[PDB]
Every structure is written in C-alpha cells, then in structure tokens.
Amino acid sequence: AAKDVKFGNDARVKMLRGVNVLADAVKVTLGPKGRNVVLDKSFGAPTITKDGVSVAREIELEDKFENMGAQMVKEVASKANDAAGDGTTTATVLAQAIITEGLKAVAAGMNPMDLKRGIDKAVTAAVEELKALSVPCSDSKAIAQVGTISANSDETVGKLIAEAMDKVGKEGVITVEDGTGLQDELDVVEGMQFDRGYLSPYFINKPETGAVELESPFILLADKKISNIREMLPVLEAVAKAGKPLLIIAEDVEGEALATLVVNTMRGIVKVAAVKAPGFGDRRKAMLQDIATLTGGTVISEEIGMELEKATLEDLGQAKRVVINKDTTTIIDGVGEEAAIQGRVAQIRQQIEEATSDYDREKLQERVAKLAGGVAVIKVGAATEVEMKEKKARVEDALHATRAAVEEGVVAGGGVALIRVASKLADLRGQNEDQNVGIKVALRAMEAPLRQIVLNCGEEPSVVANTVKGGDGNYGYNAATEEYGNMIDMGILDPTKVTRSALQYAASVAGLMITTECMVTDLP
Amino acid sequence: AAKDVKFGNDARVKMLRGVNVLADAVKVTLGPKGRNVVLDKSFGAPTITKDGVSVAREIELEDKFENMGAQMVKEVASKANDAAGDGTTTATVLAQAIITEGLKAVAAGMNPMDLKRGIDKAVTAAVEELKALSVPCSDSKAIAQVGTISANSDETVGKLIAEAMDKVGKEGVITVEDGTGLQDELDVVEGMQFDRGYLSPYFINKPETGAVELESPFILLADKKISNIREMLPVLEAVAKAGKPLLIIAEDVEGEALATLVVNTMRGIVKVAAVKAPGFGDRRKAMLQDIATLTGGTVISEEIGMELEKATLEDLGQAKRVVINKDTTTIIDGVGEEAAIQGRVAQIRQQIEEATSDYDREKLQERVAKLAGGVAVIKVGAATEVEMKEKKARVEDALHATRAAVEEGVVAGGGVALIRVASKLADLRGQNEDQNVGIKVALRAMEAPLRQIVLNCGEEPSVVANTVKGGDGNYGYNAATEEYGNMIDMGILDPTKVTRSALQYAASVAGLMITTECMVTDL
Amino acid sequence: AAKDVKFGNDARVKMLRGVNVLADAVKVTLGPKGRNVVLDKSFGAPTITKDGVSVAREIELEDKFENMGAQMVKEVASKANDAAGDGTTTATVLAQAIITEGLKAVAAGMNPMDLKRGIDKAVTAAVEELKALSVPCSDSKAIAQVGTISANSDETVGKLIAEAMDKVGKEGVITVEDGTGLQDELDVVEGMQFDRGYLSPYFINKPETGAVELESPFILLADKKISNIREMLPVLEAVAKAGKPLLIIAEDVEGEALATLVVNTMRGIVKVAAVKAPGFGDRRKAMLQDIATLTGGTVISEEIGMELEKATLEDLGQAKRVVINKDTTTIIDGVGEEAAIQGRVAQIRQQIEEATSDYDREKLQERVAKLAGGVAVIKVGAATEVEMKEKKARVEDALHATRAAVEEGVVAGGGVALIRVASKLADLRGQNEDQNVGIKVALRAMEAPLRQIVLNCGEEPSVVANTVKGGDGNYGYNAATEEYGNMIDMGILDPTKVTRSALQYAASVAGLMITTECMVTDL
Ligand SMILES: Nc1ncnc2c1ncn2[C@@H]1O[C@H](COP(=O)(O)OP(=O)(O)OP(=O)(O)O)[C@@H](O)[C@H]1O
Ligand SMILES: Nc1ncnc2c1ncn2[C@@H]1O[C@H](COP(=O)(O)OP(=O)(O)OP(=O)(O)O)[C@@H](O)[C@H]1O
Ligand SMILES: Nc1ncnc2c1ncn2[C@@H]1O[C@H](COP(=O)(O)OP(=O)(O)OP(=O)(O)O)[C@@H](O)[C@H]1O
Ligand SMILES: [K+]
Ligand SMILES: [K+]
Ligand SMILES: [K+]
Ligand SMILES: [Mg+2]
Ligand SMILES: [Mg+2]
Ligand SMILES: [Mg+2]
C-alpha cells in the first residue's frame, strides 16, 4: 500500500518515542524493587510478569513510526531471551540508553556511522573486559546466589535450583513445569526414564503400586513392531532356560504375540513385559541404540540384518533393575561397558555441536542426560494460575542464569560489572572524534542498568552511580537493603554470559537504530 | 453557571498538572544557564523574557482544574515580584517542589493540614536561620556582584548599578528607562522623588507596568484646594495647546470634578494626571516650594493671593520627564534654574543649622538628602525593541536585587543559602509525625532552586546537591563555570530579602493548596 | 485566554519554520537578480515590492508558534527600515542565517546564552572592522553609484539623486513624490525643512507611511501660545472653507483640547495639523519669521500685537505642499514672494556678517543653508499606480542609501564587506567554547547576503563565496554580469550604515531568540 516517508530528526524523534514507550514498559521491572507488568491476553486471564521479554513482546503502538521503534528495540529483548534467557530488561535498558545518547550525538551533527563504529569498538573491548573480570562459578553456594538473584531475590528458588544441579550433575537436564501443590517440588530421575508405559495392564508384579518390578532382567530391543510370537520364540525359550525376567522395547507389541507373552507371564515360566519404543522416526533408532549401549545389548532390526530368530541371550541387554508403570519406565544400572557409554556421550555431544536447531539439540541433550547423569523436573507450586505463570517465569530465568553462570562465569550484579568495565575503558579511543563520542555514549549507557535499578528503588541514580564509580572492585549498591558493599559477599552475582549478551545485542541494535535517517512505513 | 466538581486525588492530580505546566514554563529560565521564554502578545511582537513572573502571568491553561492550579501558583510569582522584584523563578520552583512533595505525602495518607503546619514551622525557622545567615551589604560591599548576578551574569549592568549607588547613595532613587543608542547610559540629574500615589485608575499609559510616564511635562503646584472648575479651566486651557503634559501636585483630588470631565472631554492624546502632596500644612508648603523651585514654578497659596487665572505658562514649572507610580512618584529632571536650585539647597542647609527640634531636623535632612542625591536614570541601550525589553527587565531585576541587598543583606547565591538553612534545620520537629513530614517536605524542597539550576545546566542535580550539602558555609556550585567554590568569593550573591520572600510566599501558597480535597470550577 | 505552551526542540522548530517562511518571502527579492513580491491589500489593488520590509510586514502565519517566529524576525526588517531605510532584505537574510546556525548549535547541546554572547562579541568586532573598512563617501559618482545600486541597478534614479545632492548639497533635503508624467522629474524649488515631529497620532493620512501630506496647505505661524478656542476659532472658521489645509507651527503644540475637538467636529474631509517650531525664544521667533516670509505670512506675537482673529486669509501664509513626518517636517514649496525671499536671504546673511558669537553665527549660517538649499522634489514617473508605488519605493531606498553613504561611508556591495569583516575575525575567541561557536555562527552567517544573492542569480553560492573569500579587498562578485571583479570599480557600493545596521539588528534579535526554550501563545 501507500507509504509515509519521514526523514531526519522527525523520524528519529518518532522512533525514539516508540523506543521510550517500550523501554519504559520494560524497565519498571528491573532490579529487586522492580514492579510487575500486566499484559492483556485476548484468550485467558491477563499475565502478571516481571520479565522484560514478555512485556517487550506485547508492546505494539498505534503510531507506525513509534511502532517501528518499538519493534526494533523489542528485537533486543527477543535476542537476549533467545541467547541467555535472562537480562532482557537489562538489555532493553542498555539499548534505550545507547539510542537516547546516540541520538543526542546524532543531533549534535556527529556522523552516525562513526558513532556506531565507536559503539561497536567500545562494546568489543567491554566484552573483553567482562571476560577478564569474570570469575568461574562452579561452587554450589555461588550457584544458589545466582539463582536467588535471578528469581527476584527468592532464596527458595535459588537453593532448589542449586540442589537440582548438584543432583543431576553437569551433564544433567533441568526443566520447569507447573505443579499441583502450593510449594516448589523437585523430581530427579536417574538412568533411562522414557515416557512409555506397559502395553497391557496385566504385567503388574506389584498390584499395590501398579508398577512392575524386574530384578536383574534381560532386555530385548526390537526396532520393528511384532505381532507374532514366532520370531523371538527361540529368545523366549533361552530366557526361560535362564529363568531371568525379560523386558522388550519394541515399536509395537500387539495382538497375538502380546497375548501369548502375557499368558506366559502369568503362567510363571517367564516374567516378561513389553513396552512401546520411544520417539518417532529418525530419533527412535538413535536412543534405542543408546538404551542398548547402556544395557550392553544390541538392537534387533532388518537394516542391521540379524532377525529375532537368530537373536540370542548375548544379543539381549542387561540391567540390574527395571520398573514399569502407566506413563513411564525406569531402567536402573544397565550392564553396559563404560567406555561405550562415554563414546556415545561424545558422539551425541558432537551431534549437539553440529545441531543448528534448538529442538533437535535439546532432544539430544535430554538423551545425554537420560543415558548419563540424571534429569530434574522442577514443579512450580502456586495457589493460582497467574502466580503459577509468574513463578514459572522467575524459576525459568533463574535456571537460565545458573546455566549461564556455569557456562561463562559470574560478575558483580546490579550493573556493577558494567560500571567497572566502563571505568576500565576510560582511555579507549576511536579513529576520529565521532568514534570517540560513540565510545563515550556506550560507556555512559553501561551505567544505565545501575541507574535504572536505583530509580526503581526510589533513590537518586546519579548519587549512587557516582558512589559506585568511586569504589573499586566488586563494591556496589545493594538495591534490596539500599546499602553499599562487596556485591559478591552479599551474594549479588550476575552471569557473565547474561550481561555480555545483553550488552552486545543492545549495542548492535542501538547502533543500527541511531544510524538511521529515513523511515518508510504504511499510511494510517 | 454549571459547576464541575472534582474530589480528592482526581482534583489533586489535575491541579498538580497545572502547577507542573506553569512551573516548567517558569523554571526553564532559572540560573545563568537558564533559557528564555517567548510570550505571544496581541499587543505587538512577542516578548522574550528570562523573568519568571512574566511567564507565570502569561500562563493560562485550557483545562479548568489545571487552570486553577496554574493561577494559584502564579500568585506565588506575582507576590514575589511585588514584594522583592527578583526570585520569582526561585519562588515558583520552591512552590512546585513543596506542592509535589506535599501531594506525595497527602497520597501517603497523612493529614494535609498538619503537613501545612509543619511546612509553616519549617519555613519560619528557615527565615530565622536566613536572617542569622545573612551578611549586611555594608560588611559585604558586593553591590556590583549582586547586580551582575541578578542581571544574568551581566557585568555591565552590575557596574552601572554600583556606580549609580556610589553617586546617589545606597538609598538614592534609581529609575530604569529606554535608551536611544546600543549602549547603557548612567545619568545622575537633579530630580525629585516622593512616596505618593496617583488617584484614579484611568490615567495608566500604554505600558502595562502601572506607572505613567510624561514627555517634557508641565508642572502645576498648589497647597490650597480649588473651589470651582472655572477657576482652573483657563489653566487647562493654557495646557490645551502648550506641548507639556500637565501634572498637578495638590493635597487630594476627587474624581467628580476632574476625572469624569477629563475622561469625557479628552480621548488620551496627552496624559493629564494629578498627584498627592506628601506631608501636611507647613511641610506640604515647604516641599511644594522646593518642587516649584526645582521646576522654576510657583505655588499658589491663599496668603500669597495670586490666583491660577493670573498664572501663565512661563510662571508654572516644567520638567523633562515624570514617572508616576502608586508606590512613589518621581520627577527625573526638572530644569528650573541651576543657580536657584543651589541657592535653595544652601537655604535649606542654613535652615538645618538654625533648626534644633528632632522632627524638623530629620525632615529637613530628608529634604537635603533628596536634593543632593538627585535622580539616577539608566538608559537601556539595545539594538531592537525586544532586546530593549529584555535588557530593561534584566536591569530592573538587578536594581530590585541591589535594593533588597542594601535593605536586608546578602547570602550565598545559587540556592546555596537555602541548602544551608535546610541543613541547619534537620533537628526541627513538629507537634506530631505529620508535622515532621511537612518539615521534611519543606527542607527537601529548599534544595529545589539548586537542583533546578543544575538541571538547567544539564548536569546531575543529585550529585551537585549532595556535594554542596557535604560542604559547609558559602561553599556552593558556580553554574556559570560548572564548578564548586566559595559562593561569596566568586561573587554569586543573592539578596536575603529575595530568597526569604520567595521561600515565604511559595511556602504559604503551597501549604494552603496541598490541603485541598475538593475543587469546584465552571464547565 | 487558554495558552498553548511548547518546550525545547518542538517550539524551536515551529519558530524556525515561521522564520523560514518569512525569510524566504523576503529573500526572494535580494540582489539585482532578485524578484518581486505581490502583496494583497484589502484597500485595493495588490502592491508589487522589491523591498524586504514591506514583504516582512505583510507576513503573518496561521500557526501561532510560527507566527511568533515570523513576528520576531519581522522586527529585524522593521528596525532596519526605521534606522537605515535600506538593507531590510539583507537584515532578514542575516537574521535567518544566524537563527538557523544558532539553532543547529543549540541542538548540538551547547549553551544558547553563551552562543548569544559570542554572536554579540563577533558582531561588535565586525562593526569595528566595518568602521575601519569603510571609505568616506565624498564623490558625486559615488553618490550616483550608491543610488543606482540601491534602486535595483537603475542608473536614472542614481543620476537623479546625484544631481539633487549636487544642487542642494550633501546635507540638503530631498523629497520623493508621485509624478504626473511617465518620467522622473527633479525640481530644486525653494523650500523649508525643520527636524520636528507631529503630536497627535490621529493626524496620519491615508498612506500608511506615517507621514501626512497636504495639497496646497494654509500656513499659520505662532511664537506665543493662545489660551482659549475662541482666539483661534474664527481662523478655524475661515480655513473651514478656505480650500487650503491648515498647518499650524506654534511654539509648543499640544492636542489636549485641539485634537479631541477637531476629531469630534471633523470626520476627515481635509487634514488639519499642528507642529512644533525648532529653537526657543529669539531663535524660534527668527525661524518663525523666516518661514512666514517664505510663505508670505506673518507670525502672531504678543510684542507685535497682531492677533489670529485680526489675521485674514491673505495675511497668513500659504504653501504648495507640506509633508509632516516624526523625524523631520518639510514645506516643499512656500510661494510667498521671490523678491521678498531674496531680500530676507540677504538680510539674514548680513546678520551672519554682523554677528560674531559662535552659536549665533552657526545658527544664522544654518538658516542661510536651509534657505539656499531649498527642497529637491523628485517626481516618480510611471505609467500605472502599481509601477508608481514600486518605483517610488526604489527611489526612496536610493535616497536612504545615499543619505547613509554621505553620513557614515561606503563599502563593497553584494555582501562582500561582510565577507571581508568575517575573514578578518577568524582569530576572534570568546570566554568559553560555546562563545567561540557563537562567534563562528555569526561569521558564517555574515556570508549569507552574498550566498543569497548568488542563489537569486541561480549560480552556486558555495563556489562564489569561496572564490570571494579567496580574494582580498574590494574583490567580489558582480551579480548583474555574473562575474568577478573589484566591487568599488564596477560601482557596486553599499552604505556602511545600512550594512552595519542590518548586521546589528539581525544579530540582536537572532541572538535573543536562539536562547528560547519555551514558547507560550494562545490556542
Ligand atoms: N538485591 C539486589 N541488589 C542489587 N542488584 C540486584 C539485586 N537483585 C537483583 N539485582 C540486579 O538486578 C538486575 C536485573 O534484575 P532482573 O532479574 O529484574 O532483570 P533482568 O535480568 O534484566 O530481566 P529479565 O528477567 O526480563 O531478563 C541484575 O543486574 C541483578 O544483578
Ligand atoms: N553564576 C551563577 N552560579 C550559580 N548560581 C547562580 C549564578 N548566577 C545566578 N545564580 C543563581 O540563579 C538564580 C538567578 O536566576 P534568575 O535571575 O533567572 O531567577 P530568580 O532569581 O528566581 O528570579 P527572576 O526569574 O524573577 O529574575 C539565583 O538563585 C542566583 O543565586
Ligand atoms: N550588480 C550587483 N552586483 C552585486 N551585488 C549587488 C548588485 N546590485 C546590488 N547588489 C547587492 O544586493 C543588495 C541589494 O539588494 P536589495 O536592494 O534588493 O536589498 P537590501 O539592500 O537588503 O534592502 P531592501 O530590500 O530593503 O531594499 C546589496 O547587498 C547590494 O550590495
Ligand atoms: K526484570
Ligand atoms: K528566571
Ligand atoms: K530586496
Ligand atoms: Mg531478569
Ligand atoms: Mg531572578
Ligand atoms: Mg535594499
């Protein structure tokens, strides 16, 4: 359709007004004293949230140029949530401050391209200084503090996430889901815990629990679906000769074969039980082979060539314990070679590195946590649905912050890290004066997270920013108690990945936005 | 007519929005780095001003509740201008800060009238501490610096005011008028100044200042009261064609014989005005004879017997300029005869030597002081009329500030004195907790002039205010050079009267107006 | 009423948009290649003008903020026209350039008051360098070239003004009026000129120039002042039908009762005017007698004894034309008797020879200079009324430029003098960096007249400006022939007063108005 075209300072003012609207919506949540934002949902109750990415996503303005500004600065929070999962509010606070100060220098006649080059140089040096300033975060108390701070100073969430990471180890996978109670519940599972139940209700060895218990059972892995008892009849006879129980992981055991095997189960000759193979095509085979590696067995398939008729006891897998139930199944201490397990771990890690999709990579990480280590599920307990959503978002942010802490390290929180970085970058210079001014607006905008935290606390941002800049090291401002001290000692830690990602994405988008002169939108 | 009524928080936020609009329009002019405001006038070209009271008076909002708030804060600037002539922007800034903090405290559930009592107690104690903190102008001797600071850091205006007050004395009358060239001029000429008032409000000239001016005025003097119009009709007829506006100095004139007939007869080509005669009886005759001898005229008396019909144009006196104001009427330059003026001066000096009673001696020393001091006139030199108006307003502000400085004293400028008196009152407590919070509101709002000065400088008001409060004494923040130092040493001095009046009027209106729950206006 | 208030950049860009509209409408007329502007008038046919002040005065915008900006820049052209009479377009162009560059520097975050101080310092130094650069104008060819350049390169107007100033002297009075024919006619007739102004503002005629004119006026002279109306009512009765407008020259005229009574009695059929007489006492009587003998009339005096009622139509004087302005009143042609005028001239010259006092000799030789010079009346010959108005405005501009040239001096035309004085001030520095940027803004805006002249020529202003700045002295760019050369040699001379006044008034208003953060207007 027809277009409205704005040029120069008019377009810059409209875009900055949109950025200010989005950033003022976002930044009322920053810090521990930050407040919540209600987002109207056309389907369901409104969402009360303290995370900046949701309130950034929900912002869309009537003025098309202001809507441009809002969308472009919303990209900052979207990217910061995609990469680190935390610091979206900090990223938007940084992006707004670079844009306002960058447009001040743009209105001062300085070249926006050179300003963007200066911002990029300053933020590259800032990332280097953050990496130098960072301390690795491996101990449990530091992780608990990171999870607490990232969850609006909720010590319960931080300690629960610290315990979960301690339980599942470094290779473990932790996810957050809703709970039925009012309290946070941690559910840690070990070994293979694929979510398929028994094909028939009659396998139950323990009727008082509905769970089949198999002590040191054999494990058959059929990559094909079976409906006749003929094929594994030699295997069934060999198992009956051995006398140990047998568990089948197959694509489908149904009809005739299933009926005869449950009949043989209640006859007592074989304590057999069959369950469906997990996943779907191109994924079922890989983690079926993972189960085989864990249990020291081999998968029976037509592609690999051997049939169930020539399958023997050596072909079948081995574990010390097997638990069947309605929804899932647990295999405890599969008898497999350790070196093969680590080789499979390395292979799936290489697949993770080669994976360019979040879904495939997260499935591979889940498989790694299944075969090695454990899986933790955090049930968010809340009296109401809106508190469930708010607490779930906070726990997710805390989990992402703990993951970023172990990935890259921690720095002093509350924006003190960016303050120290900007203080260290005082002598950085560009190629010309416009680049130096861009560096200076980048350094000044690194004070924006601390200033906005103090503004949310109700104190004076200038006084506290100058006081923190006067101090050295991790000395900073406790925004909850409104005091001063070594931010590490008071447990206010920020993930280096979160702060660095927020700074980088804010700098990139903000430089691209201050470089603009003309904006072309649709007419109202 | 039909009334729109708002209650509680709705009325309070509407009123505070009006306060904020007026106070922003005023506060953009505070400090040396403050900017100008253009006021559109249907009279002529728009006027550029750095004066707070002009911007405040020109503000009127469309929303009736916001308009009520704007008018009520405009009262602050108007009262500050009437009482001191300077600090209207400071008064408006202090008023807005008190209103904002007091309304925050009202929203905090606390009693607004106890807040008002606390503000009043805090400002009474601050006035006491400002009187204690004040340095007399004789001890300071910084009239040039005070005039420079009040003229937006213009050293020429301060130097001119200092020279005028050195020539005609600290109590001498100084009058600001438009010059002809591009440069300011100082002329100490023989003149008269008497604290008397014009009679009927239909004599106001084209300027809106309320003081009428006359170009080469005719002077008529009388101690007895006229009995009929036909007695003084030829005299008016004598001024009917003679190109000198008639100023009549008599005891007291009513409107029935003069004002109504001169309104009906005359459309206003030449301003004819009458004034009261200061003193009574022998004193009235004495100053009438003195003014007649200044202007070369004569005084008609019953004992003399010479009537106004026999009076001619040459017999009556003539001046070069006369400015009539309600507070004080001045004759800038009466020619007369210099030898006659000197002889009259010597005669009154010999009368001083002869006289011995305290009242006669003091009134006669007042006469000789008025004669010797004369009138100092400052010609505002500017290239254009808008520059003329702006520079005239700045010189008038400098004159008012220097007069307040010699009358009351001087303190540290740039809101530093208010910072100091707020620091000295941290121990002050009211009757209850609400009064204590009102005291804290007043003390926090006393920092507002400095913070607004810094905001106009573009720096950080919190950092500068905390640095100044960390210091003691005249330590403050030079906003012209953006750096700290002893405020007296760098010449940034504020009149004690100006600061005290701004604080008092802002506190009074703001404390009265934070106690409002309901607001009633038209629709 | 209700006020719309704008702040900061919004108010600044609205005001600058108004400035740009007014300045474009004015600037399309700059230079020899500049075009005309048609102004619609409610009284009749539209007027075509190349004069900047007419276009500037007629500009009024619908948007209130833009209208305020337009009025403030209209002040520049009005002041330039009132002072010099030429360079209104140059003044507006310089004003707009200073406003644009200063607002750019304000958007650059810098202090606008320091920018204003820098602009004022730079323009003061430029005025000094223009006084140094000025060459005294003591050539008839220089007068002709100044008149030609100021009349849009019309050599006939320049030659006519040169002949007039050669005939009546460089200090003689020259009056421009309409001519019946299609050609300009220079007539050096015997006339009177005295620097006096009218009293009653009602006496302004149908033309809006502020000067009244009379067709074959009756002359009345007086050294004493009458008392009642009845002393002059019969004369007012006689002139009531006499066919000649009654001009009265008394000692000190006033419309205290004359103006209102003549307003009530007369609706405006024929103008009646009263003006002051120059001098006082014996000197006033001397010039009154001289004017009476020039017009063949008599002066009423108490010593002489002859009264107004005694005087008849034949006894009192009569003239052919009288033009009354506030600055100076002229009697273009008082017939009287030629032999009587010659005898009076001889007697007054004999009075010079007899007198030995310096003041007496100088006033008597002023009398004979006024008598001998007379009035040089220029008849504007044009085929139509709109052409008559345009050519009359051009001749008036040429006259004002020649007056400013013989008063102050001449410099290179076409903005070259401003280019040179901007080049000489590249070393000038202010108190701080913001004042330096204001100085640079003023210096860059001093190139604006030349750049706008080139833009009206259609060539490239940057190339021509850089070529001129590369040169030195009177080297400049002849815009009539679109080629470079010595500005003085090809006769493109500008008055020093015109350029200096344009620069000063533009600088004053622009420096005052780039310092504005808030603007308050109606809704
Ligand atoms: N008690 C505290 N004292 C000081 N700083 C704190 C405190 N608690 C949190 N912070 C700081 O608050 C900043 C941001 O907190 P918050 O979690 O609300 O924002 P965010 O991570 O930017 O937002 P989001 O979850 O939308 O990505 C961090 O830099 C953190 O160090
Ligand atoms: N160089 C300076 N440094 C610091 N403060 C200054 C300086 N010059 C002036 N001030 C302060 O700024 C104020 C003067 O501002 P301004 O004269 O514009 O307004 P005002 O005094 O409130 O009154 P008004 O607007 O009626 O003239 C005073 O408080 C004075 O002490
Ligand atoms: N032939 C020419 N070559 C170069 N410059 C010229 C020439 N003729 C005139 N000028 C210049 O152009 C200007 C005259 O233009 P114009 O008379 O239209 O406007 P102005 O002087 O600004 O005043 P106004 O519009 O009030 O008459 C002067 O600066 C003069 O020096
Ligand atoms: K947040
Ligand atoms: K002010
Ligand atoms: K022109
Ligand atoms: Mg967060
Ligand atoms: Mg002031
Ligand atoms: Mg011209």
Side-chain angles (χ1 to χ4, degrees), chain C residues 267-383:
Chain C
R267 45 181 299 185
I269 313 292
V270 173
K271 327 101 199 178
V272 177
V275 297
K276 296 187 188 192
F280 57 95
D282 42 294
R283 305 135 272 267
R284 183 202 308 281
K285 289 186 286 180
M287 333 313 150
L288 276 150
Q289 157 256 318
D290 295 351
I291 298 174
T293 51
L294 162 65
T295 60
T298 39
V299 189
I300 168 167
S301 178
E302 303 177 354
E303 313 58 50
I304 303 304
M306 172 307 307
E307 290 181 2
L308 296 179
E309 327 183 356
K310 300 176 172 54
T312 74
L313 295 182
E314 300 93 16
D315 299 350
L316 289 179
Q318 192 192 346
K320 196 207 68 184
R321 197 103 170 192
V322 161
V323 165
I324 309 176
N325 209 29
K326 173 59 72 176
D327 178 36
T328 284
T329 302
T330 55
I331 304 174
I332 306 186
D333 190 19
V335 184
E337 179 183 350
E338 180 186 359
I341 290 162
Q342 290 154 350
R344 284 318 182 276
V345 161
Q347 159 198 354
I348 291 164
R349 179 178 66 255
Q350 176 193 3
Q351 288 162 356
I352 319 180
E353 308 307 316
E354 289 155 351
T356 170
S357 164
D358 270 294
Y359 178 70
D360 307 357
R361 186 223 73 256
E362 80 193 6
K363 67 178 164 62
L364 266 293
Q365 76 205 17
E366 279 150 17
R367 293 166 66 175
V368 300
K370 294 186 185 305
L371 292 164
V375 169
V377 50
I378 287 174
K379 310 280 206 303
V380 170

Side-chain angles (χ1 to χ4, degrees), chain C residues 168-292:
Chain C
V168 311
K170 289 203 149 184
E171 81 295 322
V173 54
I174 303 171
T175 294
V176 185
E177 82 183 11
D178 315 328
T180 58
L182 312 193
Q183 70 282 334
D184 290 2
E185 315 161 346
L186 175 60
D187 306 326
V188 180
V189 306
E190 179 71 26
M192 202 56 267
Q193 161 261 329
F194 54 96
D195 306 280
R196 274 300 173 268
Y198 73 107
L199 259 301
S200 170
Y202 168 77
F203 290 159
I204 303 311
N205 230 342
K206 166 67 218 153
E208 318 91 304
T209 52
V212 86
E213 85 289 332
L214 310 175
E215 309 93 15
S216 303
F218 207 65
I219 305 302
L220 170 60
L221 312 101
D223 84 313
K224 89 110 185 174
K225 287 318 286 216
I226 41 73
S227 163
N228 210 33
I229 317 299
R230 318 297 131 159
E231 285 93 79
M232 52 63 38
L233 241 192
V235 196
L236 185 140
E237 287 326 296
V239 308
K241 309 240 192 301
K244 319 108 173 64
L246 180 62
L247 162 67
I248 309 154
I249 326 177
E251 161 192 357
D252 201 357
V253 294
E254 175 152 304
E256 164 161 312
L258 182 61
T260 316
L261 283 168
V262 83
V263 156
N264 297 342
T265 316
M266 161 65 98
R267 45 181 299 185
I269 313 292
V270 173
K271 327 101 199 178
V272 177
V275 297
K276 296 187 188 192
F280 57 95
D282 42 294
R283 305 135 272 267
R284 183 202 308 281
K285 289 186 286 180
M287 333 313 150
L288 276 150
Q289 157 256 318
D290 295 351
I291 298 174

Side-chain angles (χ1 to χ4, degrees), chain A residues 444 451 460-463 466, chain B residues 444 451 460-463 466:
Chain A
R444 149 79 196 84
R451 288 175 172 274
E460 293 156 353
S462 307
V463 160
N466 263 45
Chain B
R444 167 64 192 82
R451 302 172 94 99
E460 318 222 295
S462 306
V463 163
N466 281 45

Side-chain angles (χ1 to χ4, degrees), chain A residues 313-324:
Chain A
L313 291 192
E314 179 263 338
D315 208 315
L316 258 48
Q318 206 59 226
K320 89 153 290 193
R321 280 271 285 99
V322 155
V323 164
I324 324 283

Side-chain angles (χ1 to χ4, degrees), chain B residues 34-38 40 58 60 152 236-237 239-244 265-266 272 383-387 390, chain C residues 1-3 75 79 113 117 225 227-228 252-254 256-257 260 504-505 508 512 515-518 520-521:
Chain B
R35 282 128 191 256
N36 288 154
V37 175
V38 200
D40 195 2
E58 272 303 300
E60 164 173 352
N152 198 39
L236 264 182
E237 262 328 285
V239 201
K241 257 71 144 167
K244 288 139 279 183
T265 317
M266 173 63 157
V272 181
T384 46
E385 286 81 0
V386 51
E387 191 199 3
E390 210 259 331
Chain C
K3 298 309 200 66
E75 172 141 359
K79 195 75 196 67
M113 211 85 58
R117 294 177 183 108
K225 287 318 286 216
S227 163
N228 210 33
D252 201 357
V253 294
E254 175 152 304
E256 164 161 312
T260 316
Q504 282 175 333
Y505 306 147
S508 57
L512 201 55
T515 65
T516 79
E517 176 82 13
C518 161
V520 172
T521 182

Side-chain angles (χ1 to χ4, degrees), chain A residues 256-267:
Chain A
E256 172 84 353
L258 156 75
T260 71
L261 54 90
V262 47
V263 164
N264 273 273
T265 323
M266 34 195 173
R267 287 301 170 81

Side-chain angles (χ1 to χ4, degrees), chain C residues 29-32 50-53 85-91 149-150 153 397 413-415 453 477-480 487 492 494:
Chain C
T29 70
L30 188 53
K50 214 182 166 304
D51 204 3
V53 62
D86 203 9
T88 62
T89 313
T90 290
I149 291 311
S150 190
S153 296
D397 285 350
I453 284 159
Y477 171 72
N478 191 354
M487 272 317 204
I492 305 155
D494 266 356

